[PDB]
Amino acid sequence: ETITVSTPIKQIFPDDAFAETIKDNLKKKSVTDAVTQNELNSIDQIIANNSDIKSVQGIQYLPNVTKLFLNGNKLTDIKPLTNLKNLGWLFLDENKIKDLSSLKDLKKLKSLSLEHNGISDINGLVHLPQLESLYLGNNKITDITVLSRLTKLDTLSLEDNQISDIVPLAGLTKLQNLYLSKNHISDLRALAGLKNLDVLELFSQEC
């Protein structure tokens, strides 16, 4: 939503680490400083990797965010991201996010990163058919059936998981970079129809 009157940053963003992130972004001197919606509208990029953030509550008030770097934090719930319709790049590596339902309406999202999140179920990704780059390395994924729906993918990382069947990737004609090392892959027939692969990693398969 939006704030109708001047309001302290700390009152909008509960998480102290995140409040500090917003403070620096807006070049304000303190999280106790009052901000307006006009100022919040100016935010289109949040760089907060390894910033000890546990909750991004308050981010709902930043309608123009297109890039969000939140790698290495303490995130679990990303429901506050639900209506950030302009989100194009979303990096959430090294967190503990498993509920991907909040991403279902992010129809402009082109790059998504969720490595090291302990994820096993990615069926929620079906709602991001426009996705171009997807990083899911170092998780506990076995079933990648849903990926057959992400036909726009040109970059896909599924390294260090528990995948055996890559048939779901057979129809992803746009794939240029495919990282599949450290899985349980034996059958590579699925790659017979891929014509644009430039980078392909398949080493260290445990069968």
Query: In the complex, which residues of this chain contact Ca ion (CB under 5 A)?
Result: 14, 16, 24
Nearer to Ca ion, 74 or 152 (CB): 74
The residues with which 8 forms a beta bridge, in sequence order, are 34
| Alpha carbon distance 16, 53 (integer Å) | 8
Distance CA 14, CA 58 (A): 7
Q: Does 14 show up as a binding residue in the annotation?
A: yes
Q: Minimal distance in Å, beta carbon 10 to Ca ion?
A: 5
d(CA 169, CA 77): 29
For residue 7, give Cα distances in angstroms to 58, 67, 119: 12, 24, 37
Pick 14 or 193: Cβ nearer Ca ion: 14
Chain breaks in the chain (C to N over 2.5 A) after: none
Task: Find the shortest distance in angstroms from Cβ 72 to Ca ion.
Answer: 17
* Closest separation in Å from C-beta 24 to Ca ion: 4
Which residue's CB atom is positioned nearest to Ca ion?
A: 24
Q: DSSP letters along 39-83, please? A: HHHT--EEE-TTS--S--TTGGG-TT--EEE--SS-----GGGTT
Contacts (Cβ under 8 Å, ≥6 apart) of 107: 85, 128, 130
Taking the least distance from each CB to Ca ion, the nearer of 24 and 198 is 24
Q: Please say whether the dihedral angle defined by the alpha carbons of residues 149, 118, 14 and 28, taken in this order, is positive or negative.
A: negative
To the question of whether residue 160 is assigned a binding role by annotation, the answer is: no
15 annotated binding-site participant: no
- Pick 48 or 128: Cβ nearer Ca ion: 48
- Minimum CB distance to Ca ion smaller for 14 or for 129: 14
Least spacing, CB of residue 69 vs Ca ion, in Å: 16
CB of 128 to Ca ion, least distance (A): 32
> Where is the binding site for Ca(2+), in residues?
14, 16, 20, 24
